[PDB]
Amino acid sequence: GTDIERKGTLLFTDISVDRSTGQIALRGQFDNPEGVLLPGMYVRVRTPQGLNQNAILVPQRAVQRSADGQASVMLLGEGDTVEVRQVTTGAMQGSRWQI
Amino acid sequence: GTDIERKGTLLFTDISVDRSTGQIALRGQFDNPEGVLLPGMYVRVRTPQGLNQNAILVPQRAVQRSADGQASVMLLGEGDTVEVRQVTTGAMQGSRWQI
Amino acid sequence: DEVLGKVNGNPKFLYAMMEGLAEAPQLRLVIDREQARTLGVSFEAISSAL
Amino acid sequence: ANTTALADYAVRNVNNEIRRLPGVGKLQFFDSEAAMRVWIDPQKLVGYG
């Protein structure tokens, strides 16, 4: 509900999955010099999920899917000929798919 | 349900929010000379939320709310003409809105 | 596709087309009913939420 | 343009008058109707249990 943004660091990643919710707990320490961050407040944390040095992003409309669910992409081959290269698609960012 | 008003001073504002509703509990002190206030009564407390010196108030009768919820005011343009200007809607006092 | 290949290549007709919506990719949700149930999750809750 | 406000005006003011006219046997209003939308944010619901 607020534009209040803060940065912090991840400290601890629990190893025991919660039995009821099937989740693992993580703890992050955040500076609160103004006292804005209040205990108990519900918040959202943007945790990075790893870095890809050679991420390939293509326009999302440029992905086809076959009857088996295998995704494929039309490619401009030598001699201006359209080639079908199969592809495995990752996550969805904006108007582009991560390949 | 009654016409009893009591003035009181804000003593304390909590730092921790309740988990179930995400709200902060506050405490004020009110003199109770006649025994009118009883322990455990549900009371609606009017708490000041900041004072602006350049606030604009027009009675609700003069502000119209369109079907999309945006409200506009009827201002007298040049040449004694009627102009539609959308306004961003704020708080409430008596029978006058805030802009 | 059989009939459209046999027809669209035949010069007797100006054009022929499936006046209809082409198949689209779908996102099937594989719900482990047993897993969800063991975590205490009813199928009613999942169905209602979705 | 909020087409829903336009459609609400048409339904409340226009369609009834025309369907009241002699000779016309049916009006086919080819759009939707107003409705309080409740756009829930499941992440907020998560936060509040």
UniProtKB/TrEMBL annotation, chains A, B:
Transmembrane segments: none
UniProt-annotated location(s): Cell inner membrane
All copies of domain Multidrug resistance protein MdtA-like C-terminal permuted SH3, residue ranges: 54-99
Taxonomic superkingdom: Bacteria
Family to which the UniProt record says this protein belongs: Belongs to the membrane fusion protein (MFP) (TC 8.A.1) family.
Name of the protein in question: RND efflux system, MexC-like protein
Organism, scientific name: Klebsiella pneumoniae
Automatic annotation (TrEMBL), chain C:
Compartment list: Cell inner membrane
Family: Belongs to the resistance-nodulation-cell division (RND) (TC 2.A.6) family.
Stated name of the protein: Efflux pump membrane transporter
Residues of the full protein shown: 697 to 746 of 1044
